[PDB]
Write a protein that holds these residues in place. Structure first.
Motif, PDB file in Angstrom:
ATOM      1  N   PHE A   1       0.835  -1.198   0.000  1.00  0.00           N
ATOM      2  CA  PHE A   1       0.000   0.000   0.000  1.00  0.00           C
ATOM      3  C   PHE A   1       0.870   1.248   0.000  1.00  0.00           C
ATOM      4  CE2 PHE A   1      -3.402  -2.643   2.340  1.00  0.00           C
ATOM      5  CZ  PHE A   1      -3.881  -3.122   1.143  1.00  0.00           C
ATOM      6  N   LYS A   2       0.830   1.988  -1.101  1.00  0.00           N
ATOM      7  CA  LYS A   2       1.490   3.283  -1.143  1.00  0.00           C
ATOM      8  C   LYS A   2       0.605   4.381  -0.531  1.00  0.00           C
ATOM      9  CE  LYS A   2       3.251   6.752  -4.356  1.00  0.00           C
ATOM     10  NZ  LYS A   2       3.744   7.072  -5.729  1.00  0.00           N
ATOM     11  N   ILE A   3       1.158   4.988   0.518  1.00  0.00           N
ATOM     12  CA  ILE A   3       0.458   6.033   1.238  1.00  0.00           C
ATOM     13  C   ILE A   3       1.299   7.294   1.308  1.00  0.00           C
ATOM     14  CG2 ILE A   3      -0.591   6.722   3.397  1.00  0.00           C
ATOM     15  CD1 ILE A   3      -1.219   3.829   3.939  1.00  0.00           C
ATOM     16  N   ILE A   4       0.807   8.392   0.742  1.00  0.00           N
ATOM     17  CA  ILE A   4       1.630   9.594   0.757  1.00  0.00           C
ATOM     18  C   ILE A   4       1.235  10.546   1.865  1.00  0.00           C
ATOM     19  CG2 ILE A   4       2.213   9.447  -1.688  1.00  0.00           C
ATOM     20  CD1 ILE A   4       0.240  11.505  -2.405  1.00  0.00           C
ATOM     21  N   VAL A   5       2.241  11.207   2.417  1.00  0.00           N
ATOM     22  CA  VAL A   5       2.038  12.156   3.480  1.00  0.00           C
ATOM     23  C   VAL A   5       2.417  13.569   3.035  1.00  0.00           C
ATOM     24  CG1 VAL A   5       2.355  12.585   5.894  1.00  0.00           C
ATOM     25  CG2 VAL A   5       2.525  10.252   4.990  1.00  0.00           C
ATOM     26  N   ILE A   6       1.388  14.420   3.099  1.00  0.00           N
ATOM     27  CA  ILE A   6       1.352  15.745   2.493  1.00  0.00           C
ATOM     28  C   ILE A   6       1.125  16.770   3.567  1.00  0.00           C
ATOM     29  CG2 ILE A   6       0.061  17.291   0.934  1.00  0.00           C
ATOM     30  CD1 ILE A   6       1.326  15.316  -0.690  1.00  0.00           C
ATOM     31  N   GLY A   7       1.734  17.944   3.433  1.00  0.00           N
ATOM     32  CA  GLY A   7       1.524  19.009   4.394  1.00  0.00           C
ATOM     33  C   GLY A   7       2.658  20.010   4.473  1.00  0.00           C
ATOM     34  N   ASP A   8       2.368  21.149   5.094  1.00  0.00           N
ATOM     35  CA  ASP A   8       3.356  22.206   5.282  1.00  0.00           C
ATOM     36  C   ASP A   8       4.641  21.701   5.962  1.00  0.00           C
ATOM     37  OD1 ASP A   8       1.636  23.928   4.072  1.00  0.00           O
ATOM     38  OD2 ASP A   8       1.451  25.360   5.728  1.00  0.00           O
ATOM     39  N   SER A   9       5.717  22.454   5.791  1.00  0.00           N
ATOM     40  CA  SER A   9       6.958  22.165   6.497  1.00  0.00           C
ATOM     41  C   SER A   9       6.771  22.244   8.008  1.00  0.00           C
ATOM     42  CB  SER A   9       8.054  23.132   6.064  1.00  0.00           C
ATOM     43  OG  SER A   9       8.437  22.864   4.730  1.00  0.00           O
ATOM     44  N   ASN A  10       7.407  21.320   8.725  1.00  0.00           N
ATOM     45  CA  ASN A  10       7.492  21.359  10.187  1.00  0.00           C
ATOM     46  C   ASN A  10       6.193  21.028  10.917  1.00  0.00           C
ATOM     47  OD1 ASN A  10       9.214  22.670  12.684  1.00  0.00           O
ATOM     48  ND2 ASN A  10      10.390  22.494  10.768  1.00  0.00           N
ATOM     49  N   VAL A  11       5.264  20.345  10.256  1.00  0.00           N
ATOM     50  CA  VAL A  11       4.063  19.906  10.960  1.00  0.00           C
ATOM     51  C   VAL A  11       4.360  18.559  11.609  1.00  0.00           C
ATOM     52  CG1 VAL A  11       2.429  21.183   9.518  1.00  0.00           C
ATOM     53  CG2 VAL A  11       3.112  18.857   8.843  1.00  0.00           C
ATOM     54  N   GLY A  12       5.458  17.929  11.174  1.00  0.00           N
ATOM     55  CA  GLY A  12       5.906  16.663  11.724  1.00  0.00           C
ATOM     56  C   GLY A  12       5.679  15.423  10.875  1.00  0.00           C
ATOM     57  N   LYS A  13       5.748  15.571   9.555  1.00  0.00           N
ATOM     58  CA  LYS A  13       5.530  14.445   8.637  1.00  0.00           C
ATOM     59  C   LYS A  13       6.626  13.386   8.769  1.00  0.00           C
ATOM     60  CE  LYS A  13       5.395  17.053   4.918  1.00  0.00           C
ATOM     61  NZ  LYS A  13       5.974  18.085   5.862  1.00  0.00           N
ATOM     62  N   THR A  14       7.857  13.875   8.800  1.00  0.00           N
ATOM     63  CA  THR A  14       8.998  13.011   9.030  1.00  0.00           C
ATOM     64  C   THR A  14       8.848  12.281  10.395  1.00  0.00           C
ATOM     65  OG1 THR A  14      10.384  14.412   7.607  1.00  0.00           O
ATOM     66  CG2 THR A  14      11.529  12.970   9.265  1.00  0.00           C
ATOM     67  N   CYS A  15       8.588  13.016  11.477  1.00  0.00           N
ATOM     68  CA  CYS A  15       8.407  12.380  12.803  1.00  0.00           C
ATOM     69  C   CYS A  15       7.241  11.382  12.858  1.00  0.00           C
ATOM     70  CB  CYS A  15       8.225  13.435  13.918  1.00  0.00           C
ATOM     71  SG  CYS A  15       9.756  14.368  14.269  1.00  0.00           S
ATOM     72  N   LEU A  16       6.140  11.670  12.165  1.00  0.00           N
ATOM     73  CA  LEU A  16       4.991  10.767  12.177  1.00  0.00           C
ATOM     74  C   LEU A  16       5.306   9.460  11.466  1.00  0.00           C
ATOM     75  CD1 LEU A  16       1.753  12.991  11.704  1.00  0.00           C
ATOM     76  CD2 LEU A  16       2.163  11.226  13.495  1.00  0.00           C
ATOM     77  N   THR A  17       5.816   9.581  10.241  1.00  0.00           N
ATOM     78  CA  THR A  17       6.101   8.391   9.451  1.00  0.00           C
ATOM     79  C   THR A  17       7.185   7.544  10.102  1.00  0.00           C
ATOM     80  OG1 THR A  17       7.674   9.585   8.029  1.00  0.00           O
ATOM     81  CG2 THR A  17       5.365   9.499   7.335  1.00  0.00           C
ATOM     82  N   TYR A  18       8.221   8.208  10.616  1.00  0.00           N
ATOM     83  CA  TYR A  18       9.287   7.512  11.335  1.00  0.00           C
ATOM     84  C   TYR A  18       8.775   6.851  12.614  1.00  0.00           C
ATOM     85  CZ  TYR A  18      13.855   6.460  13.367  1.00  0.00           C
ATOM     86  OH  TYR A  18      14.949   5.807  13.873  1.00  0.00           O
ATOM     87  N   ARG A  19       7.885   7.531  13.326  1.00  0.00           N
ATOM     88  CA  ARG A  19       7.308   6.943  14.530  1.00  0.00           C
ATOM     89  C   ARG A  19       6.546   5.676  14.175  1.00  0.00           C
ATOM     90  NH1 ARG A  19       7.809   6.360  19.829  1.00  0.00           N
ATOM     91  NH2 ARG A  19       7.796   8.627  20.199  1.00  0.00           N
ATOM     92  N   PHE A  20       5.734   5.737  13.128  1.00  0.00           N
ATOM     93  CA  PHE A  20       5.007   4.541  12.765  1.00  0.00           C
ATOM     94  C   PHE A  20       5.920   3.399  12.293  1.00  0.00           C
ATOM     95  CE2 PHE A  20       2.862   1.856   9.635  1.00  0.00           C
ATOM     96  CZ  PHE A  20       1.974   1.231  10.515  1.00  0.00           C
ATOM     97  N   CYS A  21       6.896   3.678  11.423  1.00  0.00           N
ATOM     98  CA  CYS A  21       7.723   2.588  10.866  1.00  0.00           C
ATOM     99  C   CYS A  21       8.843   2.058  11.778  1.00  0.00           C
ATOM    100  CB  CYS A  21       8.341   3.019   9.534  1.00  0.00           C
ATOM    101  SG  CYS A  21       7.108   3.274   8.206  1.00  0.00           S
TER     102      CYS A  21
END
Ligand SMILES: Nc1nc2c(ncn2[C@@H]2O[C@H](COP(=O)(O)OP(=O)(O)O)[C@@H](O)[C@H]2O)c(=O)[nH]1
Ligand SMILES: Nc1nc2c(ncn2[C@@H]2O[C@H](COP(=O)(O)OP(=O)(O)O)[C@@H](O)[C@H]2O)c(=O)[nH]1
Ligand SMILES: [Mg+2]
Ligand SMILES: [Mg+2]
Lengths: 175, 86, 86, 175
Positions: A5-25
């Protein structure tokens, strides 16, 4: 048997996309992050109903100069879209219509699930986006709303429970 | 001098001097270093652009490759699941 | 003028004194625009170094990994060589 | 299952290390090159006297700022060293003593073969480094000398022959 499943994460800088995806994986909070350039790929294998599923998250870039050429790739054969804002930053929330417009202009199918995530819910004394506002935005756009915290992964909506819920929905093709 | 006189022309031979130790000379003497600094700045900026563009290109190629791998695996699953009917 | 009088000298003086403040203003208008350009170059060079440092850090991790994988492969292969000399 | 020979390529920026290594592993001249940052790795499987060998080439960086804190990694468990200069650039030839001093200060065994390669032999009307000079340099340092062209790979010493010869000596443990 292991479908993807390809799931993309979209949003402004510094909302925490990197931290969210890293936290999950990876199941931990980053020691440090930097501006995401182009995109970052994080993958995690889970098992739903006996089936082995690979959840493949695309942590996209929010800065224009760092996403310049990439949108076609982001949106190619995407299985779901996760929109993300910073609960402590109202401007990150007002950005969402333009992100949604980019999405609508680039999706190749009318049946791709979209969800809305407010991050940094741990920072309660600095929150700028009230739940009911966010909730109305989400309802009228046909998105479930999650308020979560990559830093404290069990606060309010669990980070785990978000991506797992989405994965279950995809796997069963359920509403 | 409470009441200036003609000998105060020293000021002239003391003011025609101080001024000249800078002004038209120093204007060019800063024009040179300013244009030099302009060039340094455009070089550095150009370099940031090439670096960023290169990084972006490699990310675009990796994203393309991954999309293609996903696509291959998806066709594999489709074929296998076609075997599951006959 | 073939023979200079005080009128000619005076109009020369006023003209030079005008050109003086002109070039003075033109100097002051560039003595600090230089400071600003300085700041811009500083910032850009800073971004430059960040980009390169992050790139080099990734390349160093990748080289380290490759060396570890090589060593792993070598000890694997030499492990095969001991389970044949049995 | 196959033995790996790690072979590093050292020399000034713009002497043709990327083009040489790519020419050997891919069998082509590159469309375009850019300054090598850190290091590039190129592999090619060959069969020598019946054995399958992976030749693993480390195309290193020659610019100081692009090789900072890499040298330990270049030289870790290295099997052979290839020094490279530009036959049309005398300065790149004069750089060789410093490169060799680095090699000597970083090698961890006294039995690692080193070779010397002058590149761009195709540019005959612009050659700055006479063969006899380079030959004397190489002889006095116990290195074989090759004069070659990544662009025209059958000129003088063939590129293929250089790397295959080196690999042959490694496999045989021969002089
Ligand atoms: N307090 C708190 N800070 C967070 C959380 N998630 C991210 N951050 C911080 O917000 C900043 C931006 O995070 P990052 O993942 O780089 O944002 P991105 O640009 O959207 O990927 C970093 O300083 C993070 O430590 C969270 O859940 N709580
Ligand atoms: N004429 C000619 N040009 C070459 C040869 N090898 C490399 N070049 C050119 O030299 C320049 C730098 O090459 P490159 O491989 O990037 O040098 P590097 O920095 O040492 O890796 C490029 O313009 C190449 O096209 C050769 O054998 N002949
Ligand atoms: Mg980031
Ligand atoms: Mg190069």
């Amino acid at each position: 048997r292991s479908r993807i499943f390809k799931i993309i994460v979209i949003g402004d800088s510094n909302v925490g996309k990197t931290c969210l995806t890293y936290r999950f994986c990876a199941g931990r909070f980053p020691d440090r992050t930097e501006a995401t350039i182009g995109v970052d790929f994080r993958e995690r294998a889970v098992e739903i109903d006996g089936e082995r599923i690979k959840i493949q998250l695309w942590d996209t870039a929010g800065q224009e100069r760092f996403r310049k050429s990439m949108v076609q790739h982001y949106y190619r054969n995407v299985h779901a879209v996760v929109f993300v804002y910073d609960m402590t930053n109202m401007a990150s929330f007002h950005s969402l219509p333009s992100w949604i417009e980019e999405c609508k202009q680039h999706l190749l199918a009318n049946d791709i699930p979209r969800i809305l995530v407010g991050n940094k819910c741990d920072l309660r004394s600095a929150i700028q986006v009230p739940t009911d506002l966010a909730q109305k935005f989400a309802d009228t756009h046909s998105m479930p709303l999650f308020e979560t915290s990559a830093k404290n992964p069990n606060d309010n909506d669990h980070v785990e429970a978000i991506f797992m819920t989405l994965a279950h929905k995809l796997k069963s093709h359920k509403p | 001098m409470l009441e200036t006189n003609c000998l105060d022309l020293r000021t002239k031979l003391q003011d025609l001097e101080v001024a000249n130790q800078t002004l038209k000379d120093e204007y060019d003497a800063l024009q040179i270093t300013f244009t030099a600094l302009e060039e340094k700045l455009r070089k550095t900026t150009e370099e940031n652009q090439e670096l960023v563009t290169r990084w972006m290109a490699e990310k675009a190629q990796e994203a393309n490759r991954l999309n293609a791998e996903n696509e291959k695996d998806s066709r594999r699953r489709q074929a296998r699941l076609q075997k599951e009917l006959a």
